[PDB]
Amino acid sequence: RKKRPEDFKFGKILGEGSFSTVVLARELATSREYAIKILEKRHIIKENKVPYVTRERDVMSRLDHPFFVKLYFTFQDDEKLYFGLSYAKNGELLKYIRKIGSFDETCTRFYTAEIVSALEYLHGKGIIHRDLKPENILLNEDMHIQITDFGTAKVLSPESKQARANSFVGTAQYVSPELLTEKSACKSSDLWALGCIIYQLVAGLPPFRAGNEGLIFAKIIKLEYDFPEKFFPKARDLVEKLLVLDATKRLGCEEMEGYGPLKAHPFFESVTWENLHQQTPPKLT
Ligand SMILES: Nc1ncnc2c1ncn2[C@@H]1O[C@H](COP(=O)(O)OP(=O)(O)OP(=O)(O)O)[C@@H](O)[C@H]1O
Numbered sequence: 001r002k003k004r005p006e007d008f009k010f011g012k013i014l015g016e017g018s019f020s021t022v023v024l025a026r027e028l029a030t031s032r033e034y035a036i037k038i039l040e041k042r043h044i045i046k047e048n049k050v051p052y053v054t055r056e057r058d059v060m061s062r063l064d065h066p067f068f069v070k071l072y073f074t075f076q077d078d079e080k081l082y083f084g085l086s087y088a089k090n091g092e093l094l095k096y097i098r099k100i101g102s103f104d105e106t107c108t109r110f111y112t113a114e115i116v117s118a119l120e121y122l123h124g125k126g127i128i129h130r131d132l133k134p135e136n137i138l139l140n141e142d143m144h145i146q147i148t149d150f151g152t153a154k155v156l157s158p159e160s161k162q163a164r165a166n167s168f169v170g171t172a173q174y175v176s177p178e179l180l181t182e183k184s185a186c187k188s189s190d191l192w193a194l195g196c197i198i199y200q201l202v203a204g205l206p207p208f209r210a211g212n213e214g215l216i217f218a219k220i221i222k223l224e225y226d227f228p229e230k231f232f233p234k235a236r237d238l239v240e241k242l243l244v245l246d247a248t249k250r251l252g253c254e255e256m257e258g259y260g261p262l263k264a265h266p267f268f269e270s271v272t273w274e275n276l277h278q279q280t281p282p283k284l285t
């Protein structure tokens with residue numbers, strides 16, 4: 001039996017999207033806390049947003065991994081749709097970057113490793129995220145990552161050995177050159193975004209920065225960026241192996257033989273991959 005709005009006591013708003021509100025809720029029968037994402041049916045129908053909502057449900061239903069926000073249940077009433085999600089108490093990674101300014105090497109390594117571990121799982125299921133960015137990497141009460149925002153994700157079809165997807169989605173600062181030039185994204189598009197994120201953790205800002213999208217696009221396709229002084233040398237090597245225009249030459253992509261070579265990069269020398277989600281994350285700074 002599907003859950004109903006009356007099964008929950010709703011509390012504070014956790015965040016607002018263009019077409020959605022995420023509210024903290026306690027399930028009355030269990031006292032469990034969920035982040036419940038609510039959308040108005042009329043609104044999403046009028047704004048042609050329905051395939052984003054069905055895409056989110058469909059992609060999240062396939063995922064079962066400690067580094068992703070979990071979809072526990074969905075339900076609907078006359079006016080609304082509801083996603084019952086795990087509550088990431090500590091919110092967006094982005095706000096930590098802003099307040100601290102720049103992660104030290106141990107924190108950069110730890111969070112990068114968790115993102116790499118998440119992407120390995122996601123790509124192993126044939127799913128491209130397409131909107132990987134600090135605002136979409138949430139943190140749970142233990143400060144592990146919880147990647148979210150799957151309305152713009154794509155399940156590639158195994159049956160047709162599908163490698164490329166054609167919807168133009170994502171966030172300008174993290175969009176891959178192939179999406180700008182070839183008008184399609186692939187799993188390697190996420191590794192481009194990973195490179196931007198590692199750079200941002202260390203430098204404080206993502207690498208292709210400008211006051212508007214068009215200027216950012218022009219820089220992306222020219223690979224127009226540089227490192228600040230004091231960028232950790234092993235991180236720099238890794239970023240240069242990810243921010244590569246040719247999508248088939250990025251460390252971790254299928255044509256470069258996958259995640260083994262990525263996980264083996266000297267930047268991750270100290271990392272115990274196997275139990276990341278049970279390790280205590282390093283204290284931020
Ligand atoms: N499981 C969760 N736990 C805690 N906070 C969450 C969770 N899911 C989302 N949030 C918060 O709610 C905000 C809004 O999320 P939502 O998915 O509704 O829209 P969005 O993706 O932020 O915006 P848009 O749809 O306009 O791109 C998020 O940015 C995040 O801060």
Ligand SMILES: O=C(O)/C=C(/CCc1ccc(Cl)cc1)c1ccccc1
Pocket residue numbers: 002041042044045050053054057074075076081082083
């Ligand atoms: O999963 C369900 O219980 C059913 C739906 C209903 C599918 C649907 C989609 C869009 C609209 Cl306008 C109406 C109904 C749902 C889909 C996504 C998120 C939450 C609930």
